[PDB]
Structure formats: structure tokens, C-alpha cells
Design a protein around this ligand. Structure first.
Ligand SMILES: Nc1ncnc2c1ncn2[C@@H]1O[C@H](COP(=O)(O)O)[C@@H](O)[C@H]1O
Ligand SMILES: Nc1ncnc2c1ncn2[C@@H]1O[C@H](COP(=O)(O)O)[C@@H](O)[C@H]1O
Ligand SMILES: *Cc1c(COP(=O)(O)O)cnc(C)c1O
Ligand SMILES: *Cc1c(COP(=O)(O)O)cnc(C)c1O
Lengths: 823, 823
């Protein structure tokens, strides 16, 4: 028995061992051999060959958390936007090299295989991206931490651009299984929907419900060089399958066909409005997760360690339920439903626990974006919970009635229950009422939250409101995507920087050393060189690897202002055509984003960007002086590829519309300079960086408010400007169209008569900034020197700093960068 | 590339190696731990340690058939009653002792873990047990065979007996993985349905058909120590998953959530009338299968041996198919559609090949049970197919007419299209005409085919109608299930019997060697000994070890007659009660077997048996001289516990009905005397063992036709036999059913007024032959010498004999017990 130990298995740094476990995983686990296998089959085997290493260091850590019994923090998020795992595993796990030499000998190319990897289809935006990065940092600073979410089968669709139009294709990423996850049939949980809340004896009983089964999958995540691997548990919706006879709800009518499919699509569809699925999915992930939670709360030393009930007096001291945005919000009614109805707790205690255990992270600047369910849905499908939500509502509103007595409107502004035609429940007021720390994501964001959107909650509980500025992981977005530069940082300042990023500041004595300058400018040269090459291998274009590489790789939306940059590209077009022998710093401007399904504008904007495209990129006079590419199907894969090759970073959002943003930061670590509004996280970059090193343009938020106040009148701009007057008549007549002229109608008219985002306001200064930017591009040694002053300054934007803060200020655990022993 | 070999990855009969493997798979395959593993878990550590070896030699054998390119055989059966893999594989690869030791040195006991495997529920009775044997014999004869069926997800039902009534629960044996199988997503195939045949220029095209996907799962099958490992490849149906927006059929209406579940439940369950799903299940298993069959004819080297058309002339030399019962008949016009329509042969060069490929095993005698689909039903979902059956039909009837000219009435009887209200297609007659061999599975059976059922097919095609008597593997059904009797037969003659069964006549010497005779009787004392105990441990009763273990395990169906056996037990019950102090040999009667839902008679016989049980097992006057036990959820792993323990095998059907009967045999080899009628495979056992070593009774087929001739009139037997009359009046008054007197009204009435099978008629003769049975049990040295004579004679019943006869007189290949090389 104690001979059934971990001990025996791993020869680590040896190539001959790896060739052996690769050959084992090809032949034995895969049940394939070389006369029939494929790139994908040797791809699986290698990943399985990497995974051995990985689950050994996981057993030891999991084991360790049960021995040393610490605070476990549970990161709830419905999107986990990981994207490709292999190399990332190899770099934090140090096998990077040992595997390449073993694959070369076996006679496979690692890069041929690493690109077979589909991005993990659990994700969409800078919500789930953030989640995946945070998890890296949770491991690297050694927190006993679980991230939970749903396992979706179909991701967020794959983009096809057909004729300059976006087509939605599907991401059936798990088509061939997923070698990293481990399925748990043993751990299937029931989740309940529907019901009837019968009130009886000591409480009430949720009776007669439909059940669905959440089956967990375990995907491990490995800390940077520190021998901790933690977990990512995700849940699959499974039907009970009596469906044919038992219960004898069938025989007669098998319309339970539906029970089962409406079940099955809880886990199918990821979401890009009020659809009862979205609520079934949120709840699903929450209910299953809280049962695995309290399950370990009781199990770890505590099913033993009771004193009274295995009382949840120490549930705050041992569990942390992190609500990433209102999508997890039924975690506060479902912990009080579990603690008050199934355990036999009473309200005031059960609340002391919810609140002391729970924390909320908000990611939206404007009141409209926040979640609110219609109360009849909750009443039909989640009854028990709508009672609890209303008791919570009652009570929190007697706290504000205690505090600010006699006010009527505060009670009616802060209420969880919104009145109106279509009565609602405001999930952000649930989470604020039920969480012990609320927090933002950039300095300005957390302050408008404190000063406009939640200030009635702010002055009841100022103590609650925190800020915890977003960040990036130096693993994924430096060492990994851009080794060339990680390397010339290594020799100058050490290796400690990847586990400690504020050390980059040491680079700031080497500002002037011409040796480093050329190295830094060499790496970028190599990078654009490479991108120009993937861009013309996987797809094709007539790039200039030397040109100013301009990128805007944002979600395609109106407040993210792709049109502000298209007007500026048609401004340089119109100059290079009006004066063909004038020196214009050549640019190749690339814009990527997937639209958002049927957002009319956005789909029309991608078609505009491929219009400028077919026009200027094909004109003879334009030459190679200017070029426009729309980057197809932007994703983690792809940012790892283009973020390295960028010189200028297009963070141009209307002042006050981005709550933070994180590609912003990514671009700064990769040595690129930002042209952006004084908004989001651009504030703290510029503040760290020196505004002298940053390109801030555009109206500050003051200037916005005021123009709304006096009236934005688009037209007036149009008329005191000739290049703008011109470019809009161009679009209009059909300059960029001509097989249907009248096609850009709705953009020419939106911009011109009804732009909510003020494009024309910033147009005079945006090009008068873009010129400065092109002048210093055309100065080599200082371009590279603005850059280093940015790179050196990158520190505060490492997610490790964001998790140390959560750790000590919202959660209550120190971090630790001490490398576990083991395997 | 050559560097990626099967080679370095083993140690085989090596304790220390297997204990090392077990620890990897528990912690790296299972990502479990000793601190967390279940019993269920240590069998996936062990079953995975035993699978490495099982697949290394599969790697090798399959390469070995591509290079050797032998004619290949494919057993098409809709049911493979596999059932428990750990030990058959341990003992077919000879790692049982080495494993027992490893797991033993680790500190688990191997027997514990063996019983956690749930039987691989892909079968149901005779038909499907058989197929499973033929795979172990066909591997053992080093033949290049294949097993292709549907993977049923829910098998068929698990039997629960509640209130002495049969409850059918669901078998989701697939609950925590089946480690013996390998999912191959990547060989998924389109199986086509409904549609229309558009006849264009050079033929017809089958257009507009719904498609369902056929996913394969690979289970290696290890021959006995001859290093071959073949494949059973079962197919899992699956919905296309375009069902959401991709197709523009949905969006607006997902009522084809239905298509999706009607498609998945082709693989969902076994069956258990003209049902659209049975035909769907039949076509499905055939079609994905005939594309692997034709694929390997093209891809298995023969793509470079094309000579002409990659000729399908070399198809019956190098492929062979078996229709195991009419459940794959659509393989014949499915093949003619693939050759003529999809390839491009003319209809004779396509038929020559088809009739030279198909050979079809039969197992039915009664007309009423031959397969017959309605032609409208073939029109709707297989329109091309019923066009091709009609071609076959025209011509086959023109052959027939060339031959029996003038006879119209023969023409109207031999056709594949039956007429009445609802015209049907005689799937029996399709099978015969599209084949180069038809064969019953027992001599009395093959002849009744030629004589009465298939006769006009034998005057026309005499040569075609062969026979190949059923048989059983010796490895599962004597070595694996009887290590004790395996041991002492080894002592007196060594192994070649296990691989060569008529070698057991050598035992006829030892008939009077007192060592032998103490040892055969001792082994049985101990098999009964452990079974008395599970009959206490896993379910409950107080068994007397020292009783005549009288067993009857059949399909609970009227003609199989457990109501003849119920009447003899009520007759001992009565006897032992009228005279409590007469020495009557003590017996344990045990009946088990599934009803099959909705058959009311059967469901009432299962209750009858348990009613009688409750009465005699609680009657104090009785003591342990008599006990009636219903064994529940009879399946392959019970059959392997109950058969070692049986002393009397009751093979009692109505004379003429059983066509053969694979279990008849299992008992003989396991030393139990057979009581039974002269029919089926009793016929060639009472011939092999000599009649007087058999308890043959009752009416012969002769006198059953005779009884029908003067008309069987139940009441006259009622009016002479005075113990009968007594049990009928006991049944009716509710002696056995006190709370509902009238509960067996149906059974009584049945017997008495409309018993199709002549139970009363065989009642005097059966009670007297049993009197002679308890007499001979009352004398241990002679009952044991009978037993020695029945075991000495088992040889004619190996599946190695039957398969040989297949290979040589039908499939045309040669068996070989020669070792293939490997690991
Ligand atoms: N009682 C325990 N003692 C030690 N380690 C444990 C214990 N329970 C769970 N673990 C560890 O945690 C893993 C399971 O994680 P969980 O899903 O949290 O139960 C096990 O495989 C061990 O690595
Ligand atoms: N061309 C081939 N040469 C050697 N071995 C082969 C070849 N094709 C198939 N095999 C072997 O046969 C197994 C089954 O092949 P398949 O018929 O493709 O399922 C493969 O997994 C290999 O072990
Ligand atoms: C970093 C990243 C994002 C983040 O979007 P922002 O608007 O930059 O915060 C989105 N998608 C991908 C693929 C990313 O790599
Ligand atoms: C052999 C076997 C059968 C065969 O039934 P017969 O009555 O013998 O034809 C049925 N069930 C199991 C479990 C078997 O192994």
C-alpha cells in the first residue's frame, strides 16, 4: 500500500525518457502506430507525454493542500479563455527544451505539431482571457486555487471572412477529444431547475424539480517554475436517462426529447439578452460548484474538524468565492439556500458567512451593461431563490433605512427589485448586498463605480469598494510569444523579472547603451519579418516587413472606434494620392476583431475595412507606402503572433468608455508605443511611463461631458475640415465600393448624423498626433529609446501584482513564490 | 519515423514491471491517488496495466495482416455478448499469476477487483453469446477475423426481482468508462436514410437522404496464448451537429431536435415487430461496416495491387462476410448498391461477387420467426435498396423458372416478396439467394431446413446448404470459469485440450482411477461451496452445500418450460410433506433468466417460481431437503458462477423446438449431468457421451406431431395423474399465492386449455426420470463416473472445432494454432 506512491514516476530532463513516454502515449494510450498516425496523433501523444509530468506535480500539490490546509479560493467565471496549452505548459514546467530535442530525434518538428492545437473554446473577450491569466498567477504565487466555469463544446464561433463580409463558422474544438482534461464520471452532481417551494416545519422544501447532471472535468494549470499545478474544474450538463421508460413520464409521450436537449445545450453554446438558457447556465455552474466547494470544506480535515456542525464559522477562513462579474451572482442565494435550508442554519449566521466569503468584480463603465433578470423567470424556474432574494432585499433595505432614515428614494434606488413595466432583479445590487468587497479593474473605472454607478452603495459601505487594476502574465505575453526580447532582457537584468516584473526598471540604466538599443530594434525586426511571413504563408498580402506596423486588435464595436482609425487611413491615402513624391513614413495598418453576430454596424465596418483594402492596396501610386489588412479570426493564438510585431498600438476609445482594457498592456511589454485616449488603463500606463513617452491624444472625459451638454453637432466638424468633408463624400459616391455605391450609406449617415461616440471630435487631433508618431518612427534610435522606457516601466501591469493585491486585500492569504520540492 | 516503435515498452511476465505500470496508470491515466482511490479505481489502474500488453500485440497483429494480406473475415452480428474482460485477457496472455502477485505485493487482492467489472452489455442470449465465443476461437485459430456490431450504450435491461415480480432497470454499464475500448472519432462515417432515387444517364443516384454518423469503437480480442489479437469494432450512431443555424432548416424550427435523438437511439438500446427503428438499427450496423470492409480491400496494400478496377474479382478471394442470422441481410443489396451504383460494375459482375461473399448462419426453425420487412417500409427509408432487392427477385425467380419450368406455384412460393394484406420482403429468402453457403447450427436443425423450411432452395441449390454445429470456447467456459477442474484435468493429461478439446477422451482411462474420481467429485464440492456463499453474500437464502444443485438457466419463455420444472418442485414439495420422514435426496432447484418485457406469461412464470420459493423455503417440515431459488439478472458472469456449481443441467424444451443451445454444452464440460428432451444439441451430446450417460426423456419430435395429429387434450392427463390434479388445484385455490387466490388464473387456464407446448404430456415421464436422477445421486462413485464420462466426451463442442469447419468448408481459409511472433 504506501508502495502505491507517486514516487516512482518521472525521469524528467532526459530526451531518451521523453522519446520513450511519447512512443508509449502514441502506441498504448492512442492505440495507433506510425503506419497510420497523423500530425494530430503525434500531437496528442506529445501533449499526453507532457501531461504525465504535469499530473505528477498536481498530485503532490493537491496532497499538499490537504496536509497544510489553507484558504482555497474559487474563481467563478462562465468564460475561461485559455487558448492553446502545450508550449505554455513546457515553459512554466521547464520541459521546453527537453521536448524539442526528443521530437527532433523522433523526427517530428515541434512547431508543426504546436499549431495543430486549437484554442481552448471556452472563451470570448477580456473577461475569460483575464480569468486564464489570473489562474497562471494563482499558481505562481502558490495559492490553493480553483477556477470553475462550464465546459462548452462549441466555443465562440470561428471567423471566416468571405468577400469582406464576416461569416460565423463553429469552434468544435473538442472534436477529437482534449488531451489535457480528465473526466470525472465519479463526481457527477445533480443541479435542480423548476420546483415548487413548499413551506414546512423548520423551513421550506424545494419540491418537484427537473434535475440535470453536472459532470466535472479537470484541466490542470502549472505555475511558472514552482512545482505547483492547480486545477480548473469545468462542468458538463448531462441528462438523467430513464428517458425511454423509467419514472414513466415516457412510453406514452416521449416529448422528454426536449428535457434532454435543453439540458444538453447548457454546455453547448457560449454567448458572444434575456434567454432562459443564459440563466439556466449561470445557475448550473454555480450550483454544481458550490456542492464541490462545501464538499471539500467538510472533507479537508474538517468532516473530522467539526466542533459544532463542522460550522461554517470557519467557512470564511477556508473558502473564497470570487464572483468575476454578475454572471456568478446566484452564488449568494445558492449559498444561503444550501446553508439555511439543507444545513439548518439561520439567517443572520448564514448571511455572516455568505458576505464574509463572497467578493464581486465589476468590469463595466456604463449602467446599461449590468444584468437584471425579469422576476417571473426566476419565479418559474428558480422559486426558492426568488424568495431568498426578496428576504435579502428586505433586510439590506432596512440597513439603508437605518443609515439614511426617512429617505424614500434611496430605498427605491438601491433595491434589488427594479419596478417598471417588466419588474426586474438587479444582479449587481444582489452581489453588492451579498459581497464583502466590491472592486474595479483600472483606477478610473473603480472610481466611476464609487462615484456614479454604485455611489448609493458606496456611501452605505465605503469600506467595500476597492480597486484592483488588471494585468497580464509575463509567461504568455513575453517569454512565450516573444522569446527574442525575453532573452536580451535576461542577460541585462537576470531571470527574476518573469516571477517579479517591476525589475524591468533595471533596463532604465541601459536606455542609452547603443548595444541594447540595436538588440531591442533587432528583435522587433525579426518579429515583423516573421509575421510578414505567417501572413503570407497562412494566407498572403505584399507586406513591407520594414513599414510602421499599426495595430488595432480590439472587439469590433462603435465605442472602440475602428472608424476613427479608418478615417485616418483614408486621410493618409488621400495625401499620398494628392502629392505622389512627398515622403510619407510608410505604414501597414492591420485591424482585427470578430464583429458580434448581426451587430449591423460592425459587420458593415469589417466590409469597409476590406474596401479601403482592395482600393489602396491595389492602387499603383500608393505603392507600398500605405497598406490595410483586416486580421482574420482574431484569437489568443493570433495575439501571441501579431502583438510581438507591433510598433504602434491603437488604443483610441472614447474618453470614459473603456473600463480598463488589457491588450493595451500586452502591447507595452512587447515594445510598441501607444496612441490612445486618456482612458482605461492608458492612464496608469502613461502615469508609470511618463506621458512624454506615451502618445496621449483626444478629448479627456471632461471635454466629452461638456460636448454632450452643449450638443455634439457632428456637421460643424465636417464643415470646418476639408479632408473629412472629402473622405465622407468619397465613401458616399462609392469611392471605395463602386459595384453598389450607395452601400456605405448607413455608415456615412451614422457618423454624420448620429454618432454617439464622437468620431469627428477627435479627428482633427488624432491625425495631428499620428503625424508626431510617424516622425519619431522615422528616427530609429529614439523610437527604440521611447520603447525601452515603456518596457522598463511594464511592472505594475503583471497579473502577479494583481493577485498579490486580491490575496492580501480582498481574500486574506499572503502569496508565496517558493518552488515546491516534488515530483 | 523508424525511431517511433512498439519495441522498448514492456517487461511482460514481470511482477515488478507490472507493479510499476499499475502505479503510472492509477496516478497518470486515472489522475487519482491512493489517498483517494476507490475499488472501482484500482481496477482501472489494473485494467489499464493489463491493456498495454493486450494492445502492443494488437499493433503487431494488425500490421501483420496488412503485410501478409490474408483473405479477411467479418462476423456481422447485431449482439456480441462479451461480458467481463480482465481475467480472459489475463489468462489468454498468461499474465494471471504475475498480476495476482503484483497486485498482491501492492496489497490489494486481485479477486476483489475482478468483480467490480460490470458485464460488457452488448448482447442478450444465444445468438450473441455465440458470436463472442467464435471471436476467441477465430483469434486462437490465428485467423484474420473481425467483429462488427453496434455499440449499445444501454445494452438491454438489468433484471431486478421486486416483490417476486420482474423489474427491468437500465444497464448503463458505460457508466465510468469501459477500459477495454478505444474511441476512434476520426473514422466516423455517413449512414444514409430516406431520400429518393434519381435515375441519371448511366444509373440511379440516391439523393436527399438524411445522414447519421457512425462512430467506431475498437476492442482488441486476444486469442489463447497465440499472440494474435483481433478486433471487434462496434459503431455508436450520432446526430450531425449542424442543428442550430447551419443549414437554414432550423433557427426558425428546431423541431428536428427529434432527428437528433431518433438518430442517437439507434445505438441506445438492444431489442429486447416491424419497427422502423429495428430496420434502422440493421441498416446502420451494415453500412458503416461495408465501407470499412471495401475500404480495407482498397487501402490494405491492394490499392497498389489493383490490376484492373482494384478488382472486386479479387474481392471474394480476399474478403468474406458472415450474416449471423437475418439481422445483417441488407449487407447483400447494400453491397450490390456499393458495387453497381457507387463503384461501376454491371449487375452480374456485382452479383457474382455478392453471392460469392455472403454465407449466412441460421438459428430459427419455426416459419413464424423468419425476418420479414414491409415493402412500403423499405420504400420510405431505403428506396434504392428495395429497388435492388426487386432486381434480385426478378432474376432469382427467372433462374428458378429455368430450373422448375412449368411451375408457377413454386415461383410464387420461392420469391423474396410475400403477398397478403401487407406485402412483405422475406429477408430469409434474400439471404439465401445472395449467398454461397447457408448452414444450420446443429444436424437435426440443418436438415429440417433442407427438408421443410428451405426445401425448394435445396432442390435448386443443393450444394449450398451445409451445417456447422454450435460449440463453445473452452477458455471462458472451463479454464477461466473452472480453475479447479482445469487443474486436475491438467494433472492427468496436460494443456493441449485447452487449445484442442476432443483431446479430453484421454480421460476415459481414468474412469475408474480412484484418485481421479475423488478429485472430480472434490472440485465440485468446492464449486458448490462458494456458490452457496454468494447465495448468502450478494443476495440471501441458506443453501445446503450437500444438495443436488438442480439448475435451469433459459430465456423465460413458455416452450423452454420452467413450468414443467415448477410442477416437479411442487410434486417434491407435496411428497416431502405427505411423508416427512421418507429419505428423499436433498435438492436446490435454482431457475434464472430474463422475461423480456411485456411477455405476460413469462412475467407470471417468474412470479410462480418465486411464489413456490417463498412457500417451500419457509415450510418447517421441509428443513433443507428442498429449496426453490430464482437467480436474478442472469447474464455471462453469473453463468460462469452457477455452471461450475450445477450438478443437473435441465435442458427440457418441447421435443423439436430448440435448434441447438450453447449452454447445453457449458454444463457438460463442467460436470453436470444433463436431464433433457431429445432435441437441439442434446441429440449430438447423447450421441457423443452415449445415451445412457444422459437423462433423455419425454416425447420425441415423432410423437409430438402425432399428438397434434389426434389432438392434445390436457384434461385427460389431468384425469389420470393424481399428483397433477393436486398441483392444478393448489395453483388455483391460491395455496401459493394466499393474499390473491385467483393470481395464477392465467397459468392454470393456459396449461389446461391452450398450451401450445404439451407440458402435461411430458409430466409422468419427467417425474420418473428425475426419480432416477436422485437415485443415482444417492451413490457418489457412479454419478461421478457418469460425469467423468460426460466431461471426457465434451470435445465435439469446442468453438475451435466449429470455427474450423467454417474456415475450411465456407470461408475457405486455414486455421492455425501456431504462435504469431510479437510482443
Ligand atoms: N483526505 C485527503 N488527504 C490527502 N490528499 C487528499 C485528500 N482528499 C483529497 N486529496 C488530494 O486531492 C485530490 C482530489 O482533489 P478534490 O477534487 O479536491 O478532492 C486527491 O487526488 C489528492 O491529491
Ligand atoms: N498500411 C499499413 N501498414 C501497416 N500496418 C497497418 C497499415 N494499415 C493499418 N495497419 C495496422 O492495422 C491497424 C488497424 O487499421 P485500420 O484498418 O486502419 O483500423 C492499425 O492501427 C495498424 O496497427
Ligand atoms: C488580450 C486579448 C483580448 C483583450 O481585449 P482588450 O480590449 O484588449 O482588453 C481579447 N482577445 C484576445 C485574443 C486577446 O489576446
Ligand atoms: C451460453 C449463454 C447463454 C446461452 O443460452 P442457452 O439456453 O444455453 O442457449 C445464455 N446466457 C448466457 C449468460 C450464456 O453464457
Amino acid at each position: 500500500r504506501k508502495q502505491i506512491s507517486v514516487r516512482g514516476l518521472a525521469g524528467v530532463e532526459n530526451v531518451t525518457e521523453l522519446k520513450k513516454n511519447f512512443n508509449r502515449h502514441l502506441h498504448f494510450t492512442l492505440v495507433k502506430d506510425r503506419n497510420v498516425a497523423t500530425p494530430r496523433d503525434y500531437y496528442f501523444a506529445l501533449a499526453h507525454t507532457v501531461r504525465d509530468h504535469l499530473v505528477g506535480r498536481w498530485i503532490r500539490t493537491q496532497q499538499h493542500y490537504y496536509e497544510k490546509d489553507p484558504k482555497r479560493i474559487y474563481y467563478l467565471s462562465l468564460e475561461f479563455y485559455m487558448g492553446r496549452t502545450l508550449q505554455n505548459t513546457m515553459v512554466n514546467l521547464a520541459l521546453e527544451n527537453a521536448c524539442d530535442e526528443a521530437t527532433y530525434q523522433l523526427g517530428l518538428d515541434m512547431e508543426e505539431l504546436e499549431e495543430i492545437e486549437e484554442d481552448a473554446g471556452l472563451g470570448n473577450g477580456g473577461l475569460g482571457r483575464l480569468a486564464a491569466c489570473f489562474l497562471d498567477s494563482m499558481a505562481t504565487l502558490g495559492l490553493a486555487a480553483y477556477g470553475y466555469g462550464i465546459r462548452y463544446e462549441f466555443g465562440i464561433f470561428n471567423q471566416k471572412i468571405c468577400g469582406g463580409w464576416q461569416m460565423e463558422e463553429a469552434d468544435d474544438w473538442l472534436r477529437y477529444g482534449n488531451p489535457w482534461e480528465k473526466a470525472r464520471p465519479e463526481f457527477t452532481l445533480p443541479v435542480h431547475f423548476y420546483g415548487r417551494v413548499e413551506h414546512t416545519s423548520q423551513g421550506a422544501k424545494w419540491v418537484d424539480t427537473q434535475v440535470v447532471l453536472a459532470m466535472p472535468y479537470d484541466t490542470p494549470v502549472p505555475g511558472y517554475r514552482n512545482n505547483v499545478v492547480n486545477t480548473m474544474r469545468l462542468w458538463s450538463a448531462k441528462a438523467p436517462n430513464d428517458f425511454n421508460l423509467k419514472d414513466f413520464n415516457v412510453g406514452g409521450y416521449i416529448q422528454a426529447v426536449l428535457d434532454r436537449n435543453l439540458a444538453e445545450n447548457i454546455s453547448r453554446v457560449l454567448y458572444p439578452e434575456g434567454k432562459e438558457l443564459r440563466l439556466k447556465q449561470e445557475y448550473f455552474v454555480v450550483a454544481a460548484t458550490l456542492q464541490d466547494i462545501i464538499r471539500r470544506f467538510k472533507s479537508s480535515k474538517f468532516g473530522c474538524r467539526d466542533p459544532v456542525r463542522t460550522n461554517f464559522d470557519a467557512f470564511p477562513d477556508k473558502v473564497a468565492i470570487q464572483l468575476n462579474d454578475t454572471h456568478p451572482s446566484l452564488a449568494i442565494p445558492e449559498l444561503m439556500r444550501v446553508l439555511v435550508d439543507l444545513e439548518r442554519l439561520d439567517w443572520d449566521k448564514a448571511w455572516e458567512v455568505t458576505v464574509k466569503t463572497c467578493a464581486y468584480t465589476n468590469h463595466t463603465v456604463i449602467p446599461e451593461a449590468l444584468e437584471r433578470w425579469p422576476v417571473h423567470l426566476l419565479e418559474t424556474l428558480l422559486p426558492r431563490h426568488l424568495q431568498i432574494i426578496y428576504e435579502i432585499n428586505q433586510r439590506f433595505l432596512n440597513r439603508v433605512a437605518a443609515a439614511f432614515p426617512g429617505d424614500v428614494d434611496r430605498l427605491r434606488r438601491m433595491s434589488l427589485v427594479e419596478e417598471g413595466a417588466v419588474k426586474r432583479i438587479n444582479m449587481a445590487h444582489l452581489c453588492i448586498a451579498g459581497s464583502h468587497a466590491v472592486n474595479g479593474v483600472a483606477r478610473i473605472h473603480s472610481e466611476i463605480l464609487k462615484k456614479t454607478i454604485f455611489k448609493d452603495f458606496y456611501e452605505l459601505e465605503p469600506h467595500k469598494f476597492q480597486n484592483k487594476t488588471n494585468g497580464i502574465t509575463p509567461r504568455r505575453w513575453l517569454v512565450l510569444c516573444n522569446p527574442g526580447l525575453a532573452e536580451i532582457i535576461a542577460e541585462r537584468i537576470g531571470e527574476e523579472y518573469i516571477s517579479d516584473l517591476d525589475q524591468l526598471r533595471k533596463l532604465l540604466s541601459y536606455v542609452d547603451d547603443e548595444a541594447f538599443i540595436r538588440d531591442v530594434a533587432k528583435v522587433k525586426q525579426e518579429n515583423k519579418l516573421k509575421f510578414a511571413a505567417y501572413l503570407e504563408r497562412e494566407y498572403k498580402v505584399h507586406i513591407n516587413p520594414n513599414s510602421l506596423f499599426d495595430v488595432q486588435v480590439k472587439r469590433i464595436h462603435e465605442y472602440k472606434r475602428q472608424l476613427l482609425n479608418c478615417l485616418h487611413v483614408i486621410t493618409l491615402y488621400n495625401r499620398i494620392k494628392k502629392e505622389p513624391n512627398k515622403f510619407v513614413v510608410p505604414r501597414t495598418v492591420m485591424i482585427g476583431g470578430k464583429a458580434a453576430p448581426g451587430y449591423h454596424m460592425a459587420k458593415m465596418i469589417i466590409k469597409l475595412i476590406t474596401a479601403i483594402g482592395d482600393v489602396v492596396n491595389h492602387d499603383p501610386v500608393v505603392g507600398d507606402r500605405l497598406r490595410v489588412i483586416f486580421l482574420e479570426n482574431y484569437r489568443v493564438s493570433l495575439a501571441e503572433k501579431v502583438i510581438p510585431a507591433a510598433d504602434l498600438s491603437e488604443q483610441i476609445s472614447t474618453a470614459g468608455t473603456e473600463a480598463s482594457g488589457t491588450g493595451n498592456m500586452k502591447f507595452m511589454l512587447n515594445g510598441a508605443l501607444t496612441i490612445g485616449t486618456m482612458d482605461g488603463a492608458n492612464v496608469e500606463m502613461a502615469e508609470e511611463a511618463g506621458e512624454e513617452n506615451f502618445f496621449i491624444f483626444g478629448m479627456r472625459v471632461e471635454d466629452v461631458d461638456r460636448l454632450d451638454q452643449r450638443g455634439y453637432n457632428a456637421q460643424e466638424y465636417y464643415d470646418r475640415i476639408p479632408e473629412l468633408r472629402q473622405i465622407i463624400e468619397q465613401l458616399s459616391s462609392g469611392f471605395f465600393s463602386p459595384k453598389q455605391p450607395d452601400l456605405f450609406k448607413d455608415i456615412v449617415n451614422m457618423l454624420m448624423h448620429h454618432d454617439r461616440f464622437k468620431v469627428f471630435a477627435d479627428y482633427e487631433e488624432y491625425v495631428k498626433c499620428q503625424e508626431r508618431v510617424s516622425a519619431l518612427y522615422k528616427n530609429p534610435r529614439e523610437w527604440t529609446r521611447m520603447v525601452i522606457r515603456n518596457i522598463a516601466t511594464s511592472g505594475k501591469f503583471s497579473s502577479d501584482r494583481t493577485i498579490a493585491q486580491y490575496a492580501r486585500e480582498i481574500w486574506g492569504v499572503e502569496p508565496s513564490r517558493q518552488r515546491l520540492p516534488a515530483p
